[PDB]
């Protein structure tokens, strides 16, 4: 697709209070800094934010940029990892390093990470989290309304011996007020 729609990304769990041109220049450097573009210039032509709901469309100068716009999935910007989708009405890549993918989908080893103190942030979290190996995917979840932590995330380790040291290490610790649970997702999955 070339149409408009293959050149526009939605950008979720903005950091609270950014502005369109920060955002803009966020991904432009992210972009020119990787090498990631396709012409001398700035890839990114405009941002949309939708304050309400801390979403964002960035819109691009061609479909290329666009979709390796896409590896930065989950790329930590002012404590937030910045969950990047394509359009629902899109018609259907370089690895960036260090960028840690927000889709984290049901598998044998995806962790659930329970009794989260609300108040720290996705960077916060996976820094716990990454000391026992580096993850291949991580998300916070945060409340529908106020884009605050709502104490709970999932996450898949790169290797999935990793899954049984996290547990061991952190099932049952105290962390503030509260004790975190951790255990294979599908454990407690919902019926």
């Given at each position: 697709q070339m149409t408009r729609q293959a050149r526009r990304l939605y950008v979720?769990?903005?950091?609270?209070?950014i502005t369109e041109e920060a955002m803009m220049d966020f991904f432009n450097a992210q972009m020119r800094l990787g090498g990631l573009t396709?012409?001398?210039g700035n890839p990114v032509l405009a941002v949309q934010i939708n304050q309400d709901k801390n979403f964002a469309?960035?819109?691009?100068r061609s479909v290329d940029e666009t979709t390796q716009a896409m590896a930065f999935d989950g790329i930590i910007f002012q404590g937030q990892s910045l969950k990047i989708r394509?359009?629902?009405?899109?018609?259907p890549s370089v690895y960036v390093p260090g960028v840690v993918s927000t889709v984290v989908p049901d598998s044998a080893h995806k962790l659930f990470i329970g009794g989260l103190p609300n108040?720290?942030?996705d960077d916060?979290?996976?820094e716990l989290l990454t000391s026992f190996g580096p993850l291949k995917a991580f998300n916070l979840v945060k409340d529908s309304a106020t884009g605050l932590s709502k104490?709970?995330?999932f996450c898949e380790y790169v290797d999935i011996?990793?899954?049984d040291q996290a547990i061991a290490g952190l099932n049952g610790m105290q962390l503030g007020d509260k004790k975190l649970l951790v255990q294979r997702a599908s454990v407690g999955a919902k019926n």
């Open positions: 979720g769990n903005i950091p609270f209070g396709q012409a001398p469309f960035l819109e691009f394509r359009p629902h009405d899109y018609q108040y720290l942030n916060q979290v996976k104490g709970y995330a011996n990793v899954t």
